[PDB]
Write a protein that binds this ligand. Sequence first.
Ligand SMILES: Nc1ncnc2c1ncn2[C@@H]1O[C@H](CO)[C@@H](O)[C@H]1O
Length: 265
Amino acid sequence: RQWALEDFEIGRPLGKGKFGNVYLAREKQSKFILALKVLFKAQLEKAGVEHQLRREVEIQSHLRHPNILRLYGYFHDATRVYLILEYAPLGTVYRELQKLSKFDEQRTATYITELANALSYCHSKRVIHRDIKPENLLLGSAGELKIADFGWSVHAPSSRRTLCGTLDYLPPEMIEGRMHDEKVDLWSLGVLCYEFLVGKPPFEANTYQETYKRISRVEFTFPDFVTEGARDLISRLLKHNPSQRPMLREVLEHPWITANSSKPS
Ligand SMILES: Nc1ncnc2c1ncn2[C@@H]1O[C@H](CO)[C@@H](O)[C@H]1O
């Protein structure tokens, strides 16, 4: 229940983040393989994330889902923060997107279904992720999608804010500073589905200021190859009005999703 660094053997780095680095690790006692994410307190303090970390650790620990990355434990070096995480052999969706350039409809539909299932579970338990991007999505050995990086996640409805980072996956309401609900995740689902098929985010721009306008205006276009079934789901998800956005169940039962999805709703 209480861990120390000595209990682990550290391997190659899985990932780097401004706050920290993620390492492959093996628990000595069990030979269990897992990902160890290392954060210095000092980097952490300057930003007011110390409370943010507490929210991430608590929510992820008590959540159990096939499509949600598992947090096994946490401990603190003097002074470093260590997170013990499930290890995903197939890596990030973001990496997969770079290699394939774009995802086929069958693969896209499956990720959405898995995402939707995980989100339904999250929403049921009163959790909203609020930050869903391919960099935050991991792949299981079976190749199943697993959601991760719950830091920005919070209980809703809530007012938690845009200043620090890229706006590509943020809803108009969050960027505009209006209070937001679970619908924020539905918007994210719409952005991801578009990015998977097109290979780029719908509101992507050279400029932060320009992206802000695109999101607020909600002006996006479809390449010719995107199917009408795909367009319909995307258009429904990307709605300036959160109330107009469909429920997760609606997404799961959508004809395009049902037809092209390997995994059942
Ligand atoms: N368990 C893990 N397996 C593989 N990569 C991971 C894991 N946890 C975090 N990462 C990587 O480290 C980054 C920081 O969380 C992620 O965006 C991802 O690239």
